[PDB]
């Protein structure tokens, strides 16, 4: 199904402030890819968002209850699986 190097899906856009929901079932620790150990979304790490043929890159800026949207906290105050990603650049053809 979902290929390796999978983290989540975009659920909110505010121009240059993306919010991502982690779709990993559990064990947010050492998702092995290509025999090398990378960690699930962390403050200093990058992410990649492929759009058809070009890949948008971004950097995580906030993790936890801060990245949760406005009224999602109102609906439930105990759910925190969001990250806030800020776009940086893109890779062309």
């Amino acid at each position: 199904t979902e290929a390796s190097t999978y983290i989540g899906t975009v659920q909110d856009v505010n121009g240059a402030n993306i919010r991502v929901v982690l779709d990993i079932n559990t064990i947010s620790s050492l998702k092995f890819v290509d025999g090398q150990g990378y960690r699930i979304g962390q403050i200093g790490s990058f992410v990649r968002i492929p759009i058809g043929y070009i890949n948008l890159f971004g950097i995580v800026s906030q993790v936890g209850a801060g990245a949760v949207p406005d009224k999602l906290l109102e609906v439930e105050p105990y759910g925190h699986r969001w990250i806030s990603v800020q776009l940086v650049g893109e890779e062309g053809i």
């Binding site: 199904t1 058809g52 043929y53 070009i54 053809i93």
Partner: protein
């Protein structure tokens, strides 16, 4: 008035990368031409087959001139239809003034020659058909990919078997493989299972006795139901209905490669489907100049959701334009390489 190749290539790459939207294909006579085992291609084109029939066989040449009076240069389909019509009339031998049974002998001879010429195996694992088969298995799509073919050979079947690709062509059975028609319309097929339809028949079709039940299997000598439509009073009708029903699916996409749009029934069905469903999209891919396809340009001018790709011309959204030759995707091997790169 000027179009960019890279934009269309990116659009196609994004389209093929999708999973839920249904996809289909059409494989015409121009696809096997792009693959060559000897110096010549492993299978000739329609014109090559017509020339081979003409020079391989004054009474015989009368039929070709007789049909040319009311029609352009006759092809294999026209000749076969004329032979079928001649056999329909019992005492039809007076038109050719050659007995009343030489028509059957000529039909047997041409059928045997066609079967001998077409019963070829594709050599090597690097054929584009294997690449397409691998691409199908790459992404586990929500809706399977259907394949329509108008050829006579079994290259697609062999390629599918080579890479372990399950499929279902409307025939169930091990020895006789009778035609099951209720399961086609019931359509509760396995999700992973693909489908393959041969619109013009192949060498594995044989007609039974007065029971007339159609079956598929090992080809027999002096028997080949390679007739395009022939006549009746039928699998062809349900196959056309299946194509039309697929074309009505939401956000359905159909891709044509190597097809010159010379037929009339297929063009009418495509036009009706495009008019009925405003969301369908068709990628007309050619490997020549667009001036050769009058029907295709007429349909592209009439319809808005039809896209044409030629060597030096393209019609997009009722607006004919010029490229920024170009569009190397027209060749079948390049399309297979693009699909393989997309899968990888």
């Amino acid at each position: 008035s000027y179009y960019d190749t890279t934009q269309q290539l990116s659009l196609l790459k994004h389209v093929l990368s999708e999973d839920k939207r249904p996809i289909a294909f059409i494989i015409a006579a121009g696809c096997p031409v792009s693959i060559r085992h000897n110096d010549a291609p492993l299978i000739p084109d329609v014109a090559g087959l017509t020339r081979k029939i003409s020079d391989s066989f004054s009474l015989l040449m009368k039929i070709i001139q007789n049909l040319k009076t009311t029609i352009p240069n006759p092809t294999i389909e026209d000749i076969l239809s004329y032979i079928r019509l001649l056999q329909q009339i019992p005492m039809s031998g007076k038109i050719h003034d050659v007995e009343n049974s030489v028509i059957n002998a000529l039909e047997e001879s041409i059928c045997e020659l066609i079967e001998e010429e077409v019963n070829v195996d594709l050599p090597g694992n690097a054929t584009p058909y294997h690449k397409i088969a691998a691409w199908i298995n790459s992404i586990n799509r929500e809706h399977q990919v259907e394949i329509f073919t108008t050829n006579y050979d079994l290259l697609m079947e062999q390629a599918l078997e080579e890479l372990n690709v399950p499929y279902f062509d409307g025939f169930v059975g091990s020895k006789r493989a009778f035609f099951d028609i209720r399961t086609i319309e019931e359509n509760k097929l396995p999700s992973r299972w693909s489908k393959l339809w041969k619109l013009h028949g192949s060498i594995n079709w044989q007609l039974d006795k007065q029971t007339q039940t159609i079956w598929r299997g090992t080809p027999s000598k002096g028997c080949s139901l390679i007739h395009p439509s022939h006549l009746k009073y039928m699998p062809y009708l349900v196959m056309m209905d299946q194509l039309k029903l697929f074309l009505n699916q939401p956000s359905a996409i159909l891709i044509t490669c190597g097809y010159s749009y010379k037929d009339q029934h297929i063009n009418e069905v495509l036009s009706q489907g495009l008019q009925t469903n405003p969301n369908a999209l068709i990628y007309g891919l050619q490997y020549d100049v667009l001036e050769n396809y009058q029907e295709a340009k007429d349909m592209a001018l009439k319809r808005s959701n039809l896209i044409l790709l030629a060597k030096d011309r393209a019609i997009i959204g009722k607006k004919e334009g010029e490229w920024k030759l170009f569009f190397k995707l027209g060749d079948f091997q390049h399309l297979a390489s693009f699909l393989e790169e997309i899968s990888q």
